[PDB]
Amino acid sequence: ELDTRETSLLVAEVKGWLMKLASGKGEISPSAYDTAWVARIPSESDSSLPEFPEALEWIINSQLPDGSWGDDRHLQLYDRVLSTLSCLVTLKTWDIGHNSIAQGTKFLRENMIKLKQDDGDLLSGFEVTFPMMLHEAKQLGLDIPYETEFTRLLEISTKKKLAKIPLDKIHSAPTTLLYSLEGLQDLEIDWQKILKLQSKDGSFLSSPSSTACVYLKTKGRKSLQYLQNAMEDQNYAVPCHYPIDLFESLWVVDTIERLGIDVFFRDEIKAVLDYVYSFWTNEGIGWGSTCLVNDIDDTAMAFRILRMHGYNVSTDAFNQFWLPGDKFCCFVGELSHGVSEMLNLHRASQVDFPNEAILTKTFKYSHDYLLNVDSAHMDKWATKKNLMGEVAFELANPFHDCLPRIYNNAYIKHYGMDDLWIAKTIYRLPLVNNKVFLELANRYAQQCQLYQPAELTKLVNWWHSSRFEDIANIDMLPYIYYVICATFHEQEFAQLRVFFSKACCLNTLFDDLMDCAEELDRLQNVIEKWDISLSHELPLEYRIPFQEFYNTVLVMTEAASKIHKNLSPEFICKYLSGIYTKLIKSEIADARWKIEGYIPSFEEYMENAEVSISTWVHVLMSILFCGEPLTEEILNTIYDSRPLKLDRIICRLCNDIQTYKIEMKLGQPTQGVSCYMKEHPGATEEDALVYLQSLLEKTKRELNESYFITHENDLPKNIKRFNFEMVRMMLITYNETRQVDLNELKDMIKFCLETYRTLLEHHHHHH
Numbered sequence: 211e212l213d214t215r216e217t218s219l220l221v222a223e224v225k226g227w228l229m230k231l232a233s234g235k236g237e238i239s240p241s242a243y244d245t246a247w248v249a250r251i252p253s254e255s256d257s258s259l260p261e262f263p264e265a266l267e268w269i270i271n272s273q274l275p276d277g278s279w280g281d282d283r284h285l286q287l288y289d290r291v292l293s294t295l296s297c298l299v300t301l302k303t304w305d306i307g308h309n310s311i312a313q314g315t316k317f318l319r320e321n322m323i324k325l326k327q328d329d330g331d332l333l334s335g336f337e338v339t340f341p342m343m344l345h346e347a348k349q350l351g352l353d354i355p356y357e358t359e360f361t362r363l364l365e366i367s368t369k370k371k372l373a374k375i376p377l378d379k380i381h382s383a384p385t386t387l388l389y390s391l392e393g394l395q396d397l398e399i400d401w402q403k404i405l406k407l408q409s410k411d412g413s414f415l416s417s418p419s420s421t422a423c424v425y426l427k428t429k430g431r432k433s434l435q436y437l438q439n440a441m442e443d444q445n446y447a448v449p450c451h452y453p454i455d456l457f458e459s460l461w462v463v464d465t466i467e468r469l470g471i472d473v474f475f476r477d478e479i480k481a482v483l484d485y486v487y488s489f490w491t492n493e494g495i496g497w498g499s500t501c502l503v504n505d506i507d508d509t510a511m512a513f514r515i516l517r518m519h520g521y522n523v524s525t526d527a528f529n530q531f532w533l534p535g536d537k538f539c540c541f542v543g544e545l546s547h548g549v550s551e552m553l554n555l556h557r558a559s560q561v562d563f564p565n566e567a568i569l570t571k572t573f574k575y576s577h578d579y580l581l582n583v584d585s586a587h588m589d590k591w592a593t594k595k596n597l598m599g600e601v602a603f604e605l606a607n608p609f610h611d612c613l614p615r616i617y618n619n620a621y622i623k624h625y626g627m628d629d630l631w632i633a634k635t636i637y638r639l640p641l642v643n644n645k646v647f648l649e650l651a652n653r654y655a656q657q658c659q660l661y662q663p664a665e666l667t668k669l670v671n672w673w674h675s676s677r678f679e680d681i682a683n684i685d686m687l688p689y690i691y692y693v694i695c696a697t698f699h700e701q702e703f704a705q706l707r708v709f710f711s712k713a714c715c716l717n718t719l720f721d722d723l724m725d726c727a728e729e730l731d732r733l734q735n736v737i738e739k740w741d742i743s744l745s746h747e748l749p750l751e752y753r754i755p756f757q758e759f760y761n762t763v764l765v766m767t768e769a770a771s772k773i774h775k776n777l778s779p780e781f782i783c784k785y786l787s788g789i790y791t792k793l794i795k796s797e798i799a800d801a802r803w804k805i806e807g808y809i810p811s812f813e814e815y816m817e818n819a820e821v822s823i824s825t826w827v828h829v830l831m832s833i834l835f836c837g838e839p840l841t842e843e844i845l846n847t848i849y850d851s852r853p854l855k856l857d858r859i860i861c862r863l864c865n866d867i868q869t870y871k872i873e874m875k876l877g878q879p880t881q882g883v884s885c886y887m888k889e890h891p892g893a894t895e896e897d898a899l900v901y902l903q904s905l906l907e908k909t910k911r912e913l914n915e916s917y918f919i920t921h922e923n924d925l926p927k928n929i930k931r932f933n934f935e936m937v938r939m940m941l942i943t944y945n946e947t948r949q950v951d952l953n954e955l956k957d958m959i960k961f962c963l964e965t966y967r968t969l970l971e972h973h974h975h976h977h
């Protein structure tokens with residue numbers, strides 16, 4: 211337990227943070243290096259006085275107890291040495307803070323000799339920023355070491371890299387050197403020309419210190435004003451980049467959604483996404499509302515989250531980052547990029563709509579990159595708690611093959627409540643990384659488990675009293691409960707979770723029985739009539755599931771009639787028996803085609819195989835309990851709606867692709883791969899599967915579009931949601947990477963088996 215307060219207190223606090231973010235106000239730790247840089251500036255009124263005296267007081271009051279400045283909780287020598295240097299140079303320049311200078315130089319005298327290679331993350335621009343700062347300290351005659359094997363090797367290397375940069379490319383187009391111009395002060399820079407590469411707020415890649423250098427080289431008005439306002443907005447201790455209102459708000463929401471605590475924050479999240487959307491363009495976005503360029507990380511992040519929330523955003527935003535070879539950059543003209551942006555690119559590419567081929571290219575490229583990372587070495591200094599864990603999860607879990615609580619429970623183990631971030635120096639994003647998010651995540655995760663014992667206990671009791679043991683393994687039940695718990699986790703969906711579980715069990719039994727039967731006609735006879743009276747003519751193995759199927763329908767009909775007062779019990783019960791008879795007989799059909807010698811068309815086989823796929827019946831039943839109002843027109847048209855068509859197609863294709871070898875290791879002809887082959891001579895099975903795999907991927911894009919966008923005359927929200935999750939519960943069942951892994955599910959299996967034993971012993975205990 212990480213926080214003591216009531217949930218209501220935590221939730222109110224985060225709501226405050228989110229509404230501040232929805233007005234562009236966030237929280238980034240100050241940068242001692244940047245605060246000291248900007249405080250070099252003298253007032254224009256009186257050049258003998260500082261423009262930012264409060265920043266000089268902050269420097270003096272923020273020195274750490276060992277004489278250094280920098281990140282308090284994670285000591286990194288690069289961060290401490292660079293930050294302390296800057297602070298010393300500025301206190302000395304203004305001839306103040308004699309004691310602080312004394313502590314600072316002493317710290318540097320004990321630790322400069324400790325600087326080495328591969329001792330932490332290269333801070334951004336470190337190669338120029340540290341030698342420059344060191345040289346400025348010497349010009350001031352500070353009493354610190356001025357040469358080590360490390361510092362002279364660094365200066366030699368940097369001088370060679372700088373001597374190879376043609377300087378006019380720095381003034382010609384945006385480069386990452388704009389972030390660290392203070393590291394270039396002594397270079398041959400046409401500072402006047404550099405002014406044309408400022409951001410719309412007068413900053414240079416949003417770096418206060420780099421902006422500060424330009425202002426002292428040029429006295430440009432907009433750059434002073436950017437600093438004056440950043441100083442006043444941040445209370446006179448500025449971060450190393452400002453503002454990052456787009457980056458910070460999207461990462462905070464993303465964190466909230468990946469932890470699965472967005473259930474508490476729906477309105478506030480929408481407010482933040484409206485703020486972000488007011489800055490969305492057809493060329494994406496950068497980290498902030500005044501930044502110079504767009505980047506692929508922010509653009510992928512915003513595209514994915516906005517689209518998932520029903521906003522209209524275009525994949526044209528990704529064209530600017532295309533490179534020959536169907537590769538991508540993070541900023542145009544970059545020389546390399548990192549893993550966070552490919553992770554987010556990879557995630558974004560899977561919410562593609564039809565005819566958005568650029569996202570197939572960004573998917574292939576990011577997937578390929580992510581497959582090739584050096585995992586032994588990725589984030590080896592653990593700025594994040596488990597970045598390589600997030601990569602591995604993302605590679606292994608396709609968006610449509612993953613369920614919400616499965617993703618959330620995995621991220622909860624990855625989430626670092628005290629992660630740090632690397633830029634000019636080390637910084638913190640306490641709104642992204644904090645113990646409050648993780649405590650709320652753990653509490654909601656425990657809420658999702660609370661109802662499971664009782665729900666599982668009723669399911670096992672229903673299994674026993676239905677006499678399924680008298681024909682039949684019960685292991686099927688914890689698994690079915692597991693996936694519906696992961697998709698409809700909110701406690702209010704209990705009737706949905708229980709009825710869905712019963713329905714899936716009943717059909718799994720019937721389908722299994724029929725796939726090993728011919729007097730299916732003796733059965734279709736009874737089922738056609740749906741008459742519990744003619745149950746007695748069934749051969750017992752069909753009698754047990756039939757009578758429980760008939761009973762569960764009545765039970766479902768009573769619960770639904772209590773819920774839906776406008777629907778008559780008779781309408782509901784004709785509907786439920788109708789859908790289950792249609793499914794069952796279609797399952798007899800798929801059976802008698804598998805016994806006789808019939809490989810049909812592809813159109814004909816899949817006309818019956820799409821109804822046979824059983825998936826739509828759980829949609830049609832479950833919507834009775836999904837919390838949405840219903841009408842007869844809805845229940846009469848739902849089977850033919852576009853999202854239900856797509857459901858049936860995707861699940862049939864998936865089944866026929868993923869089981870194909872499991873089918874011919876064993877010689878079975880009636881399947882989509884064969885039926886395709888009987889219609890395209892010269893297609894190998896390799897080409898049939900390729901075609902079916904392509905049709906599957908195309909249908910998934912149609913399902914994305916039908917789902918994330920709210921159309922005119924669209925199905926109610928929770929209904930579209932169930933249909934969406936029904937496809938996913940199907941697909942993950944065939945994601946064989948995940949299946950052999952699968953934890954919670956073993957506990958569910960054990961709980962069910964213990965509950966069964968007690969039932970079978972009639973609670974008499976045996977040794």
Ligand SMILES: CC(C)=CCC/C(C)=C/CC/C(C)=C/CC/C(C)=C/COP(=O)(O)OP(=O)(O)O
Nearest residue numbers: 332333334335451454457497505507550632633
């Ligand atoms: C890892 C993250 C948070 C982002 C990468 C992609 C972008 C464009 C983020 C926007 C945040 C921002 C305002 C960044 C400016 C500072 C900066 C140059 C960060 C990149 O630092 P590193 O890539 O860790 O360091 P090096 O430049 O030393 O390789």
